Design a protein around this nucleic acid. Sequence first.
DNA 1: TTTT
Lengths: 216, 216
Amino acid sequence: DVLMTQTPLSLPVSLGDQASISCRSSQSIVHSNGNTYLEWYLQKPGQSPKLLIYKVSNRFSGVPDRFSGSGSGTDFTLKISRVEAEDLGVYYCFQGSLVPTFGGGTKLEIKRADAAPTVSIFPPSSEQLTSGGASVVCFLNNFYPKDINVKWKIDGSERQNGVLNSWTDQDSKDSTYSMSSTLTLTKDEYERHNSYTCEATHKTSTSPIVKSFNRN
Amino acid sequence: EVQLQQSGTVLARPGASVKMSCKASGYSFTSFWMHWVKQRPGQGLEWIGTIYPGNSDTSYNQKFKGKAKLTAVTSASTAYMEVSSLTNEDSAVYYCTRRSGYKYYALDYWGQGTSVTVSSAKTTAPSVYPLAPVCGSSVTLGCLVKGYFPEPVTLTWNSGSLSSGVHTFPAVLQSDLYTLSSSVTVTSSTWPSQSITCNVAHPASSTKVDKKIEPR
DNA sequence: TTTT
Ligand code: NI
């Protein structure tokens, strides 16, 4: 079956810069009638996909002339001459014949300067402990790029079970990212140990960014 | 003016079936292929299958054969799709979209999507726990909304007076129940001097909780 | 021409 590969998966650019996304079919997608049915769709978050380009290089009505497409047989490309704020979202190439198949999508986002995360650790609340639960929360705010790793440690020993992470979408004002990492234990298990550590490894730092607390 | 009005959000149980509609208007419903697209939360777009309202010809993605069933009531100019044997992987937003004939030869019109949620969990009200600093001209406070179903909850700070420095992290399913958190960053001369409260509303359970953030 |  035809496989549609899109590169890159994520594409950070400043507003004004040019953008170029690539799409590759595992094999020629040329129809017998001679026409190539390759389309490009843009999906802004919380919205339905909107048609951009059809038949490899044709622009749908109402699409800005910044958008242009090209390619032949196996390799296709969508170029944006000048990225506007309204162009941010996920781009999908679609194969409209034989067995319609979408590409994995390329997320166009904003490029900004690096920013180290501000880490904050929070012990379980008294109200939660009273109920037999123990959630230790760690906020890692305003960093860039989005790639980051968080390791939890209890009394020095690493802990992987019970962790729940969540990332916000790129900040609409400063273009940074934030994430939350929660470690849930039982009040008993929580009380059987003294030190809790939340450490982050980000490119803006050679050493890990640590935040710990002793429940005693 | 072509419009594709889809049916509302659906909450279903595992193993059950869900029949969703897509009312087509502004064009000859029978003259065009109607396509169905799936989008699991945070994943890409997947093509399910298509149907030709005129003669009821249908084509399916091998993956959704004997899973999804496309039908149409040309009289009502409405297309239907029924997804049976519901599992957690069937939770997603499903779009119906028209494939244009002459000129564009692409999916020019899309519906707004129908969000389906497949869970055996019952309406469970949230546990709102205040996150205070461990016992720096800025203080980061938090609020943990743990164990609720279904989405959504609405979290505010000081009834909405506090809009700056807030990061509300998207909810995450931790074994059939959702968890969400939020952080607010204020100067050290604001808290604990002045009061900072976390307001949580969970519509489905008629719950409205306020949680004052108090020092340890 | 698309939905082979
Ligand atoms: Ni193949």
